[PDB]
Amino acid sequence: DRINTVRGPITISEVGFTLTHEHICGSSAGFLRAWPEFFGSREALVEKAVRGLRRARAAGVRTIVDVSTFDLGRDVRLLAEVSRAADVHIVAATGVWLDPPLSIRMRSVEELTQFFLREIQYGIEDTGIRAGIIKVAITGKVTPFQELVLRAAARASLATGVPVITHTAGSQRGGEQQAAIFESEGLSPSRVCIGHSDETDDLSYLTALAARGYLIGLDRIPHSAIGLEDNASATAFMGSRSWQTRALLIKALIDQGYMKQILVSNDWLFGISSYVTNFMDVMDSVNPDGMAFIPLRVIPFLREKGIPQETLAGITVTNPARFLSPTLRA
Amino acid sequence: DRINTVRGPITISEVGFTLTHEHICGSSAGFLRAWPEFFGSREALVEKAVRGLRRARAAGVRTIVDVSTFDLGRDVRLLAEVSRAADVHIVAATGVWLDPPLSIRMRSVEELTQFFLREIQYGIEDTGIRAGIIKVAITGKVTPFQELVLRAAARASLATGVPVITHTAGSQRGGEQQAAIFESEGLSPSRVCIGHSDETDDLSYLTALAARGYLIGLDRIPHSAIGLEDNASATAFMGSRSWQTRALLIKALIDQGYMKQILVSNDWLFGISSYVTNFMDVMDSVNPDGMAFIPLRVIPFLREKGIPQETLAGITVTNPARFLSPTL
Ligand SMILES: C[As](C)(=O)[O-]
Ligand SMILES: C[As](C)(=O)[O-]
Ligand SMILES: [Zn+2]
Ligand SMILES: [Zn+2]
Numbered sequence A: 001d002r003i004n005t006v007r008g009p010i011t012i013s014e015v016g017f018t019l020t021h022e023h024i025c026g027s028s029a030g031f032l033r034a035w036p037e038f039f040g041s042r043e044a045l046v047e048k049a050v051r052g053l054r055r056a057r058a059a060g061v062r063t064i065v066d067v068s069t070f071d072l073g074r075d076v077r078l079l080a081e082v083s084r085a086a087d088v089h090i091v092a093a094t095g096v097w098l099d100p101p102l103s104i105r106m107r108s109v110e111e112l113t114q115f116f117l118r119e120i121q122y123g124i125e126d127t128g129i130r131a132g133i134i135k136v137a138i139t140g141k142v143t144p145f146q147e148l149v150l151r152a153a154a155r156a157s158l159a160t161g162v163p164v165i166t167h168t169a170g171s172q173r174g175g176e177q178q179a180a181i182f183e184s185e186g187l188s189p190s191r192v193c194i195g196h197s198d199e200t201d202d203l204s205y206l207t208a209l210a211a212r213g214y215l216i217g218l219d220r221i222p223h224s225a226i227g228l229e230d231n232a233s234a235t236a237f238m239g240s241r242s243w244q245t246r247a248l249l250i251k252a253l254i255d256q257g258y259m260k261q262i263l264v265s266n267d268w269l270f271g272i273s274s275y276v277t278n279f280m281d282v283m284d285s286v287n288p289d290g291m292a293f294i295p296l297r298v299i300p301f302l303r304e305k306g307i308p309q310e311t312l313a314g315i316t317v318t319n320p321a322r323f324l325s326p327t328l329r330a
Numbered sequence B: 001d002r003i004n005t006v007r008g009p010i011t012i013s014e015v016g017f018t019l020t021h022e023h024i025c026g027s028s029a030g031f032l033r034a035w036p037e038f039f040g041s042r043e044a045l046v047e048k049a050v051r052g053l054r055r056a057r058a059a060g061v062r063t064i065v066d067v068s069t070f071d072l073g074r075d076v077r078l079l080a081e082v083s084r085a086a087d088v089h090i091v092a093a094t095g096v097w098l099d100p101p102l103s104i105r106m107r108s109v110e111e112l113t114q115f116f117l118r119e120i121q122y123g124i125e126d127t128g129i130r131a132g133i134i135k136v137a138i139t140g141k142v143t144p145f146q147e148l149v150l151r152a153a154a155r156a157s158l159a160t161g162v163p164v165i166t167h168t169a170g171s172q173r174g175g176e177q178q179a180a181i182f183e184s185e186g187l188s189p190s191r192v193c194i195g196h197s198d199e200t201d202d203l204s205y206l207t208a209l210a211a212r213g214y215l216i217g218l219d220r221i222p223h224s225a226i227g228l229e230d231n232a233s234a235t236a237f238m239g240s241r242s243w244q245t246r247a248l249l250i251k252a253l254i255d256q257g258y259m260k261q262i263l264v265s266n267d268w269l270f271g272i273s274s275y276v277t278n279f280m281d282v283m284d285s286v287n288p289d290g291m292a293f294i295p296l297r298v299i300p301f302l303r304e305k306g307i308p309q310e311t312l313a314g315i316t317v318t319n320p321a322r323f324l325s326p327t328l
């Protein structure tokens, strides 16, 4: 079976150790093309990303999933360039994030479904690169527009077998909202990762979703504004919980018997224009390991806590391949 | 003081009959590239725009100013292809419209100034095509962010000599609040067009801005949903006033002695994705002339009402050239 990447299809055996929720750059549609100097230059951004991916590769990573949507400024040509240079597979995304422009947010559920299908079945822009995942997002109480996006995502997943990754901004729960909508459309929970789940400490909430068959994205592990009391922007974006506390949720879910439902990532990037200026510097100061943080810090931490190799490989290799492999029915 | 167009620099004498507020396509950044099918295809949109601009050309139009900004999905390569095929000058825009994404709306006044300067001085994207105007938009009361945009526009204009064009959302006013900000930055009123000024019938407001040396953009002349009362989206976009009512404002300002302050346009486009689906069909149902509406309908209407042809030539040829020619 085959997974689409920015350099073409690859087999399941080629996927390897995967980071399921990452970005090369967090931006806005067309922004990198219109003002590349915001990032120093396109060339500087490419250099920062290639070095960062090569560090991750040296720590064991073989694939990342860039869950940047059109409205997060996804540039698949950038992804292809850095994937080739770093020799790390990149899966690209369709879907809608938090900042849809009018041309997206004025659209109907049917139109959004056709847009997602175009990006998965035909390709992104004029590149022939096909999305391998659908990324959606909601705020607090799912808005009428976000509900349209979720339903369109479920429909595109049902037609193509590609999985859906979702999260709730602003609050620590919210996965129940998305689950009810997805299920109303007939989508299998095994096609869905409820992301940014490490933002809550409510284990009962995560375990119940896992028991229903949802994948649980513990994918903002290195985000933390501890020590950055000076910075309101940093606390608002990364939060005030230690990375070890977040990582321990991984062990907790394993102990509950749901290793098979866990996906782990960094939610990192190599440039960011969608927040305050120079926020990349703040992030880099918190986590100098970048995307290598999971393999260099979290994996050893879990081992020390007594999680066996084979379990860690199940989480980092087996689960992502099962998740990404397009699967029409469960 | 040559003017930059999507085909390169031109002389003032080459500008000719100008439409000062137009669009090839009203969209969002990256959207035409991502989902061209929304417009049938990119190829269909080009064909429709070339056909339309050629009709305007035959009616005498020589230049249009496409005031689409980054966030209105300005695609300068589309502009260039259409300009060349139709053989009509197109001036491209920098600035910020009413849908800035986070990467724009999180920026400071200094950062916005740099962005506008890049698009004017260096070029748009990787094309080397330089913006010839700065477009800004406000809602009701200028928002804190919109005030940054206005100040950045003023600063970019002062540094480069290129003019600024505005508008305020809806059938509002807003010019007095825009002008205050511009003047606090030391910008000359002669470098600013208060656009969509045909949305109001308040002549006291219009004449006072004209008296201060502002240009008055009477530039949505064909927009009217009269006859389309059962379409709320039509009414909300084009209004309930007739084209003649809008066009009579041109006469009113001429009568008051302000012919030199008037700029006229259609605010037309050949595709639109930033609003309701298929809205282009509704607009085309009302104004089949498209961008040719000004020279075909408005000019003769004003002639019939007794305005001398020399005055109309001043408004359609002289005023736009004086406005577009960069100063310092
Ligand atoms: C690009 As994000 C901070 O919503 O994971
Ligand atoms: C794109 As418009 C409605 O400001 O002319
Ligand atoms: Zn997120
Ligand atoms: Zn995320």
Ligand SMILES: [Zn+2]
Binding pocket: A021, A022, A023, A067, A267
């Ligand atoms: Zn993310």
Ligand SMILES: [Zn+2]
Binding pocket: B167, B196
């Ligand atoms: Zn407008």
Ligand SMILES: [Zn+2]
Binding pocket: B021, B167, B196, B267
């Ligand atoms: Zn307009």
Ligand SMILES: [Zn+2]
Binding pocket: B021, B022, B023, B067, B267
């Ligand atoms: Zn307009």
